[PDB]
């Protein structure tokens, strides 16, 4: 579907049996969620943002449904104020920018 | 044109007679530049993001050229690690997300 930018580009996604809304963020290399429960092993990691850096957990090969699209990738879990779908996953649903 | 997301979506801009590269950021409501010199008055403002918040100057009605597209809008200047073009200007050039 095509989405204009008069409003924040929110998408509904399913991950680990949980439902959430996330922002399609072309300005984000990675995908991060605020508190969700994911299983298994992860690794420590720090993300750099506009206001500074945050410490997150890094999970790989995590199944994720973005607008009905099934894909798998690396998902970070950390203290973000907004759930974000990054380029690492937007690339997987074929999402592009147009103008 | 069309822009896939395998690489950060950078565009070349001209603003205040100065050249810069910026990220087409669908996850940003506003446009922010680190160190550029803009004329005129401005109003202090704070912006939030991953990592915390930062104090920035808010200039309105600033002529800016984005990939050859001449438009005008609010531009923030402040301690940001990367130049960002927000939704406030992306809508001006008719930029959309597609998948
Ligand atoms: C619900 C409430 C919390 C919300 N507020 C907002 C409005 N806000 C603050 C913003 O749009 N804020 C923008 C912003 O930082 N956006 C950010 C996402 C975000 C949104 C909301 C809250 C926190 C983070 C997203 C931006 O693309 C920044 C740009 C950037 C790139 C390189 C270096 C520094 C910065 N990119 C990143 O932070 O990349 C790192 C990563 C971000 N997410 C996963 S990895 C500013 C640039 C204007 C949206 S949702």
Tab-separated table of C-alpha atoms and ligand atoms in Angstrom:
chain	number	residue	atom	x	y	z
A	1	UNK	CA	0.000	0.000	0.000
A	2	UNK	CA	1.139	3.597	-0.409
A	3	UNK	CA	1.474	5.795	2.664
A	4	UNK	CA	1.764	9.594	2.697
A	5	UNK	CA	3.535	11.423	5.515
A	6	UNK	CA	0.950	13.869	6.845
A	7	UNK	CA	0.844	11.628	9.837
A	8	UNK	CA	3.370	9.332	11.571
A	9	UNK	CA	3.703	6.119	9.494
A	10	UNK	CA	2.338	3.623	12.026
A	11	UNK	CA	2.016	-0.058	11.221
A	12	UNK	CA	0.508	-2.882	13.235
A	13	UNK	CA	2.828	-5.783	13.840
A	14	UNK	CA	2.854	-9.128	15.607
A	15	UNK	CA	5.940	-10.407	17.325
A	16	UNK	CA	6.288	-13.274	19.745
A	17	UNK	CA	2.611	-13.666	19.927
A	18	UNK	CA	2.286	-10.089	21.080
A	19	UNK	CA	0.616	-7.191	19.284
A	20	UNK	CA	2.018	-3.669	18.939
A	21	UNK	CA	2.187	-0.606	16.724
A	22	UNK	CA	5.493	0.496	15.276
A	23	UNK	CA	6.741	3.446	13.260
A	24	UNK	CA	8.133	2.799	9.757
A	25	UNK	CA	11.413	4.660	10.209
A	26	UNK	CA	13.669	5.137	7.180
A	27	UNK	CA	16.014	7.073	9.461
A	28	UNK	CA	16.671	3.984	11.596
A	29	UNK	CA	19.182	1.268	10.656
A	30	UNK	CA	17.708	-1.079	13.236
A	31	UNK	CA	14.378	-2.162	14.688
A	32	UNK	CA	13.709	-1.559	18.362
A	33	UNK	CA	10.830	-2.204	20.745
A	34	UNK	CA	10.021	-1.041	24.135
A	35	UNK	CA	9.309	-3.881	26.472
A	36	UNK	CA	8.128	-7.009	24.753
A	37	UNK	CA	8.997	-10.524	25.835
A	38	UNK	CA	11.302	-12.406	23.526
A	39	UNK	CA	12.727	-15.849	24.188
A	40	UNK	CA	16.252	-17.099	24.193
A	41	UNK	CA	19.645	-15.651	24.141
A	42	UNK	CA	20.503	-12.102	23.336
A	43	UNK	CA	23.549	-9.809	23.420
A	44	UNK	CA	24.174	-6.431	25.081
A	45	UNK	CA	24.271	-3.494	22.716
A	46	UNK	CA	24.191	0.300	22.754
A	47	UNK	CA	22.175	2.425	20.286
A	48	UNK	CA	23.009	6.011	19.422
A	49	UNK	CA	20.134	8.440	19.076
A	50	UNK	CA	19.239	12.062	18.884
A	51	UNK	CA	19.338	12.498	22.569
A	52	UNK	CA	22.219	10.209	23.429
A	53	UNK	CA	22.845	6.437	23.752
A	54	UNK	CA	20.780	3.570	25.216
A	55	UNK	CA	21.604	0.077	26.254
A	56	UNK	CA	19.563	-2.645	24.570
A	57	UNK	CA	19.278	-6.470	24.193
A	58	UNK	CA	19.892	-7.794	20.691
A	59	UNK	CA	17.856	-10.750	19.445
A	60	UNK	CA	18.517	-12.360	16.059
A	61	UNK	CA	16.294	-14.410	13.795
A	62	UNK	CA	13.083	-13.145	15.390
A	63	UNK	CA	9.897	-13.864	13.415
A	64	UNK	CA	7.886	-10.696	12.853
A	65	UNK	CA	4.672	-9.823	11.070
A	66	UNK	CA	4.569	-6.288	9.701
A	67	UNK	CA	1.197	-5.356	8.024
A	68	UNK	CA	0.492	-9.021	7.161
A	69	UNK	CA	4.019	-9.536	5.955
A	70	UNK	CA	6.055	-12.308	7.403
A	71	UNK	CA	9.695	-11.759	7.909
A	72	UNK	CA	12.560	-12.533	10.270
A	73	UNK	CA	15.374	-10.360	11.536
A	74	UNK	CA	17.282	-8.786	14.377
A	75	UNK	CA	15.143	-7.042	16.948
A	76	UNK	CA	16.390	-4.867	19.770
A	77	UNK	CA	14.524	-4.477	23.045
A	78	UNK	CA	15.389	-1.415	25.088
A	79	UNK	CA	14.185	1.810	26.577
A	80	UNK	CA	12.915	3.550	23.539
A	81	UNK	CA	9.952	5.857	23.835
A	82	UNK	CA	8.680	4.580	20.480
A	83	UNK	CA	8.605	1.187	18.777
A	84	UNK	CA	10.513	1.394	15.536
A	85	UNK	CA	10.723	-0.707	12.442
A	86	UNK	CA	14.152	0.027	10.842
A	87	UNK	CA	15.692	-0.447	7.402
A	88	UNK	CA	16.910	-3.904	8.415
A	89	UNK	CA	13.286	-5.038	8.230
A	90	UNK	CA	11.655	-2.488	5.905
A	91	UNK	CA	14.056	-3.846	3.319
A	92	UNK	CA	12.461	-7.246	3.750
A	93	UNK	CA	8.917	-6.140	2.837
A	94	UNK	CA	10.093	-4.268	-0.168
A	95	UNK	CA	9.396	-0.860	1.291
A	96	UNK	CA	10.710	2.184	-0.604
A	97	UNK	CA	10.593	5.987	-0.549
A	98	UNK	CA	9.053	7.824	-3.486
A	99	UNK	CA	8.774	11.411	-4.683
B	1	UNK	CA	12.751	9.092	-7.834
B	2	UNK	CA	12.368	5.737	-6.112
B	3	UNK	CA	14.694	4.880	-3.268
B	4	UNK	CA	15.172	1.416	-1.797
B	5	UNK	CA	16.357	1.092	1.763
B	6	UNK	CA	19.437	-1.099	1.553
B	7	UNK	CA	21.457	2.061	2.269
B	8	UNK	CA	20.617	5.074	4.445
B	9	UNK	CA	18.389	7.344	2.304
B	10	UNK	CA	20.657	10.373	1.981
B	11	UNK	CA	19.825	13.397	-0.158
B	12	UNK	CA	21.763	16.492	-1.071
B	13	UNK	CA	20.300	19.756	0.085
B	14	UNK	CA	21.016	23.483	-0.193
B	15	UNK	CA	19.918	25.727	2.651
B	16	UNK	CA	20.954	29.218	3.669
B	17	UNK	CA	23.370	29.172	0.760
B	18	UNK	CA	25.187	26.177	2.280
B	19	UNK	CA	25.393	22.586	0.995
B	20	UNK	CA	24.637	19.572	3.165
B	21	UNK	CA	23.630	15.919	3.094
B	22	UNK	CA	20.616	14.783	5.109
B	23	UNK	CA	18.644	11.640	5.948
B	24	UNK	CA	15.074	11.353	4.586
B	25	UNK	CA	13.609	10.288	7.934
B	26	UNK	CA	10.018	9.051	8.039
B	27	UNK	CA	10.419	8.563	11.776
B	28	UNK	CA	10.976	12.278	12.395
B	29	UNK	CA	8.224	14.849	12.639
B	30	UNK	CA	10.739	17.670	12.330
B	31	UNK	CA	13.853	18.623	10.368
B	32	UNK	CA	17.115	19.148	12.238
B	33	UNK	CA	20.620	20.197	11.188
B	34	UNK	CA	23.765	20.251	13.127
B	35	UNK	CA	25.743	23.451	12.737
B	36	UNK	CA	24.563	25.520	9.872
B	37	UNK	CA	24.223	29.244	10.022
B	38	UNK	CA	20.757	30.550	9.540
B	39	UNK	CA	19.699	34.171	9.574
B	40	UNK	CA	17.181	35.740	11.873
B	41	UNK	CA	15.291	35.253	15.026
B	42	UNK	CA	14.445	31.875	16.460
B	43	UNK	CA	12.651	30.286	19.389
B	44	UNK	CA	14.288	27.877	21.861
B	45	UNK	CA	12.810	24.428	21.714
B	46	UNK	CA	13.485	20.961	22.965
B	47	UNK	CA	13.391	17.821	21.001
B	48	UNK	CA	13.126	14.304	22.263
B	49	UNK	CA	14.463	11.058	20.818
B	50	UNK	CA	16.222	7.796	21.518
B	51	UNK	CA	18.774	8.600	24.164
B	52	UNK	CA	17.128	11.649	25.689
B	53	UNK	CA	16.477	15.267	24.654
B	54	UNK	CA	18.405	18.203	23.231
B	55	UNK	CA	17.989	21.969	23.160
B	56	UNK	CA	17.665	23.373	19.653
B	57	UNK	CA	16.900	26.636	17.841
B	58	UNK	CA	13.717	26.725	15.838
B	59	UNK	CA	13.704	28.810	12.649
B	60	UNK	CA	10.491	29.096	10.623
B	61	UNK	CA	9.968	29.847	6.995
B	62	UNK	CA	13.346	28.704	5.880
B	63	UNK	CA	13.876	28.219	2.135
B	64	UNK	CA	15.404	24.794	1.534
B	65	UNK	CA	16.168	22.820	-1.553
B	66	UNK	CA	15.768	19.041	-1.226
B	67	UNK	CA	17.041	16.975	-4.203
B	68	UNK	CA	16.443	19.997	-6.447
B	69	UNK	CA	12.979	20.553	-4.963
B	70	UNK	CA	12.497	24.073	-3.641
B	71	UNK	CA	10.253	24.264	-0.583
B	72	UNK	CA	9.963	26.244	2.649
B	73	UNK	CA	9.517	25.222	6.237
B	74	UNK	CA	10.597	25.078	9.855
B	75	UNK	CA	14.175	24.040	10.407
B	76	UNK	CA	15.760	23.174	13.729
B	77	UNK	CA	19.458	23.602	14.354
B	78	UNK	CA	21.060	21.902	17.321
B	79	UNK	CA	23.384	19.189	18.666
B	80	UNK	CA	22.259	16.321	16.446
B	81	UNK	CA	24.654	13.598	15.276
B	82	UNK	CA	23.041	13.568	11.833
B	83	UNK	CA	21.214	15.979	9.552
B	84	UNK	CA	17.582	14.924	9.288
B	85	UNK	CA	14.765	15.858	6.907
B	86	UNK	CA	11.466	15.259	8.722
B	87	UNK	CA	7.866	14.648	7.696
B	88	UNK	CA	7.249	18.367	7.898
B	89	UNK	CA	9.331	18.811	4.742
B	90	UNK	CA	8.914	15.362	3.199
B	91	UNK	CA	5.226	16.064	2.664
B	92	UNK	CA	6.264	19.201	0.754
B	93	UNK	CA	7.967	17.200	-1.958
B	94	UNK	CA	5.228	14.594	-2.078
B	95	UNK	CA	7.436	11.875	-0.646
B	96	UNK	CA	5.695	8.591	0.196
B	97	UNK	CA	6.490	5.125	1.562
B	98	UNK	CA	5.572	2.139	-0.583
B	99	UNK	CA	5.500	-1.644	-0.238
C	1	LIG	C1	4.936	8.545	21.337
C	1	LIG	C2	6.036	9.583	21.489
C	1	LIG	C3	7.131	9.021	22.369
C	1	LIG	C4	6.545	10.021	20.105
C	1	LIG	N1	7.089	11.202	19.782
C	1	LIG	C5	7.436	11.347	18.482
C	1	LIG	C6	8.063	12.607	17.914
C	1	LIG	N2	9.518	12.690	18.078
C	1	LIG	C7	10.139	12.867	19.403
C	1	LIG	C8	10.337	12.617	17.021
C	1	LIG	O1	9.901	12.468	15.884
C	1	LIG	N3	11.652	12.703	17.254
C	1	LIG	C9	12.687	12.606	16.176
C	1	LIG	C10	13.563	11.371	16.482
C	1	LIG	O2	14.537	11.438	17.178
C	1	LIG	N4	13.173	10.241	15.894
C	1	LIG	C11	13.869	8.933	16.018
C	1	LIG	C12	12.829	7.949	16.502
C	1	LIG	C13	12.125	8.353	17.800
C	1	LIG	C14	10.802	8.746	17.745
C	1	LIG	C15	10.143	9.112	18.910
C	1	LIG	C16	10.796	9.089	20.125
C	1	LIG	C17	12.120	8.691	20.165
C	1	LIG	C18	12.799	8.319	19.009
C	1	LIG	C19	14.385	8.260	14.747
C	1	LIG	C20	15.380	9.007	13.889
C	1	LIG	O3	15.250	8.502	12.605
C	1	LIG	C21	16.872	8.896	14.352
C	1	LIG	C22	17.703	9.805	13.502
C	1	LIG	C23	19.178	9.726	13.820
C	1	LIG	C24	20.052	9.040	12.983
C	1	LIG	C25	21.408	8.978	13.278
C	1	LIG	C26	21.905	9.599	14.408
C	1	LIG	C27	21.055	10.278	15.250
C	1	LIG	C28	19.697	10.337	14.953
C	1	LIG	N5	17.597	7.625	14.152
C	1	LIG	C29	18.000	6.809	15.111
C	1	LIG	O4	17.799	7.012	16.322
C	1	LIG	O5	18.655	5.700	14.705
C	1	LIG	C30	19.020	4.809	15.725
C	1	LIG	C31	17.883	3.998	15.865
C	1	LIG	C32	16.621	4.400	16.062
C	1	LIG	N6	15.721	3.450	16.149
C	1	LIG	C33	16.212	2.221	16.035
C	1	LIG	S1	17.876	2.348	15.807
C	1	LIG	C34	13.443	13.907	16.093
C	1	LIG	C35	14.541	13.878	15.040
C	1	LIG	C36	12.497	15.035	15.685
C	1	LIG	C37	7.174	10.269	17.720
C	1	LIG	S2	6.486	9.093	18.722
